[PDB]
Amino acid sequence: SNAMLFCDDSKKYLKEQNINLKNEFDKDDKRVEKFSLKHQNIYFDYSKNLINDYILKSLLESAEKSSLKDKIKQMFNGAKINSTEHRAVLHTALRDLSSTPLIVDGQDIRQEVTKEKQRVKELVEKVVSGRWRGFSGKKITDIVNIGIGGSDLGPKMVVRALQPYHCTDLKVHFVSNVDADSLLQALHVVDPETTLLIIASKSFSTEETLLNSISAREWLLDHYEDEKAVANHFVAISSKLDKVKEFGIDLEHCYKMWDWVGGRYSLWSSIGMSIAFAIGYDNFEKLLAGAYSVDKHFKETEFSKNIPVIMALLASYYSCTYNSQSQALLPYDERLCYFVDYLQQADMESNGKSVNIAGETVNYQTGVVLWGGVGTNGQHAFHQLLHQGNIFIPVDFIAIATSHHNYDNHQQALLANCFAQSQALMFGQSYDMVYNELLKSGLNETQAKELAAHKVIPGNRPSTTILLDELSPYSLGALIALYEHKIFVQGVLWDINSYDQWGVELGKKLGKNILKAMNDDSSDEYQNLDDSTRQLIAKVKNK
């Protein structure tokens, strides 16, 4: 295509600068000032990355020469930047506070977002206040969200992350996998007379959600033995109005899903109602507002001071020039235990693409594996490989300055460990240092010589630390939005469509064919199987 090539020959010459982090911090008393940014109460420290002024300048020039400035405007204005589906990409509009005019494919987006939020707010208030009653007349005590992917991970992550803010006296449960263990974990602990279930399914056709929904309905009706009970116990987030009505849900309680909201960008929409059912609508608004803060930052700030742009440039630089194939994300807070899982979908489902916008196969690597784990626990699981393995892996740390309790010694130790692990990545420890330490420990020269090489830690390994003041609805919204925009920037620089997901279609089709084969070994489906699939089906049956 005619697009600027990001991963070009010039990028390799940047890495020949041979950056040594210890030397840079020693020589440059402005290093932190140069390579850190603030947005409100988020501090973004990228100074332990393998950059200097020349490398950063070069990368920023690539951003400036690219289509990025135009693409940011196009996203926010509702241009159809999801070019394979001919759709706008307007998750930003879900959290807008600017109130500027936005008319897209005939709809006043401001009015439609606002009116839908009012419907959800009113639902949550009616349920929490006890005005909503189940079919036997009882107040609701439990909410069960039924959805998968986009319709599960964001709500589940946010509900956990904001646990200190739970305030509705409702318990919220998440059913997702078609594996019935998921449904059963909820059903074992809820009462049909006091439970409200949410079916989150755009087309009412996602297989797992359909089976879970039907099985939930059967459970409810086994209790009540009256079809009319569905209306008091189920709501839907769907566009498939006929199937929602056929299930027995009142269309007053069918909530909107717009085509310009990708599933993996949908927690901000009515899909997030389970968040509001846990933390109340006021806190859901604060979540939205935090994201807006970052949207305004991203939209308005010159690239050299723009956090998501810097995040994207660093990531793409590493995966281009060091040929790295993964990135580690290390949240140093228990509350963020589903954060990595959530961003795996946002990042990998967006940028795991092999063709550009024009449909040409690209000759450079695109999205890499995102993985990681909560700290300090990861220090005792996989940090060994981060320190002494021989895989190049960029590392992001998320630190939270203050927690939600008064165990101040624990919080101090948590932070000290976070900072110590980035410092260890930067400095390492050399043979001479180790050898001298072993002698001082009481080993003799022979013993110290035999052991020291095994303790050497190469160091000079990069990291970024993102420090939040606290983990509140607002700050979490800001955090998630930073990564949403990082992912957007990377897709623009790689000239891919971050907003489609055609790769998942084949497995859905093959799954239907295999289900048919499992039920009828005379079928064309069974006959056409590869023999691996055929013998796996046989092993299952002859159990």
What is the contact mask toward a second copy in residues 293 to 332, using x (rule: CB under 8 A)? Answer: -------------------------------xxx-----x
Residue nearer to a second copy on the CB measure, 98 or 533:
533
Residue 438 engages a second copy in binding (rule: CB under 8 A): no
State which residue has the least CB distance to Ca ion: 64
Residue nearer to a second copy on the CB measure, 142 or 334:
334
Compute the distance between CA of residue 498 and CA of residue 351 in angstroms, rounded to an integer: 5
Compute the distance between CA of residue 498 and CA of residue 515 in angstroms, rounded to an integer: 31
Among a second copy, Ca ion, none, what does residue 64 contact (CB within 5–8 Å per kind)? Ca ion
Residue 178 engages a second copy in binding (rule: CB under 8 A): yes
Q: How many helices (H) and strands (E) does the chain have?
A: 22, 13
Query: According to CB under 8 A, which one of 63, 386, 480, 481 is a site residue for a second copy?
Result: 386
Residue nearer to a second copy on the CB measure, 173 or 383:
383
Stretch that binds a second copy, among 4-12, 104-112, 272-280, 501-509 (CB under 8 A): 501-509
Tell me which of 30, 86, 188, 380 is the catalytic residue: 380
Stretch that binds Ca ion, among 64-72, 151-159, 242-250, 264-272 (CB under 5 A): 64-72
Give, for 341, the enclosing helix (H) or strand (E): helix 339-344
39 as an active site residue: the answer is no
Pairing state between β 326-331 and 395-400: parallel
Q: From residue 470, how far is each of 175, 326, 473 by CA, in Å?
A: 29, 28, 10
> Least distance from C-beta 422 to a second copy, angstroms?
7
Residue 64 engages Ca ion in binding (rule: CB under 5 A): yes
Residue 226 engages Ca ion in binding (rule: CB under 5 A): no
Residue in 69, 100, 104, 70 with CA at minimum distance from that of residue 90: 104
Residue nearer to a second copy on the CB measure, 113 or 496:
496
Q: How many CA atoms, within 13 angstroms, populate the side-chain half-sphere of residue 304? A: 9
Query: According to CB under 8 A, which one of 194, 427, 460, 521 is a site residue for a second copy?
Result: 427
Residue ranges in 85-144 that form contacts with a second copy under rule CB under 8 A: none
Task: Give me the sheet containing 254-255, strands edge to edge.
Answer: 171-175, 142-146, 195-200, 234-237, 254-255
Tokens of 539: 């092993």
User: Does the CA dihedral 147-153-155-157 come out positive or negative?
Assistant: positive
Residues whose CB falls within 8 Å of the CB of residue 423, separated by 6 or more in sequence, listed in order:
none
What is the contact mask toward Ca ion in residues 11 to 50, using x (rule: CB under 5 A)? Answer: ----------------------------------------
Identify residue 124 by its one-letter amino acid code.
V
> Least distance from C-beta 65 to Ca ion, angstroms?
6
Identify residue 241 by its one-letter amino acid code.
L
Residue ranges in 223-262 that form contacts with a second copy under rule CB under 8 A: none
Tell me which of 193, 208, 349, 484 is the catalytic residue: 349
Q: For 185-200, b where at least 16 C-beta lie within 10 A, e where not — what string? A: ebbeebebbbbbbbbb
Residue nearer to a second copy on the CB measure, 440 or 454:
454
Query: According to CB under 8 A, which one of 17, 205, 502, 520 is a site residue for a second copy?
Result: 502
Give break positions in the chain: residue before each, C–N beyond 2.5 Å.
Answer: none
Tell me which of 22, 73, 115, 508 is the catalytic residue: 508
349 as an active site residue: the answer is yes
User: Which region holds residue 212: left if phi is over 0, alpha if psi is between -120 and 50, else beta?
Assistant: alpha
Stretch that binds Ca ion, among 57-65, 76-84, 235-243, 508-516 (CB under 5 A): 57-65
Sequential DSSP letters for 404-469: SSS-HHHHHHHHHHHHHHHHHHHH-B-HHHHHHHHHHTT--HHHHHHHHHHH-B------EEEEES
445 as an active site residue: the answer is no
Contact 218, 236 (CB under 8 A): no
Residue ranges in 264-283 that form contacts with a second copy under rule CB under 8 A: none
Among Ca ion, a second copy, none, what does residue 417 contact (CB within 5–8 Å per kind)? a second copy
> Least distance from C-beta 361 to a second copy, angstroms?
8
User: Does the CA dihedral 109-353-479-199 come out positive or negative?
Assistant: positive
Residue nearer to a second copy on the CB measure, 355 or 439:
355
Tokens of 478: 């800001």
Among a second copy, Ca ion, none, what does residue 407 contact (CB within 5–8 Å per kind)? a second copy
Query: According to CB under 8 A, which one of 426, 438, 480, 489 is a site residue for a second copy?
Result: 426
Annotated catalytic sites, by residue?
349, 380, 508
Contacts with Ca ion, residue ranges (CB under 5 A): 64
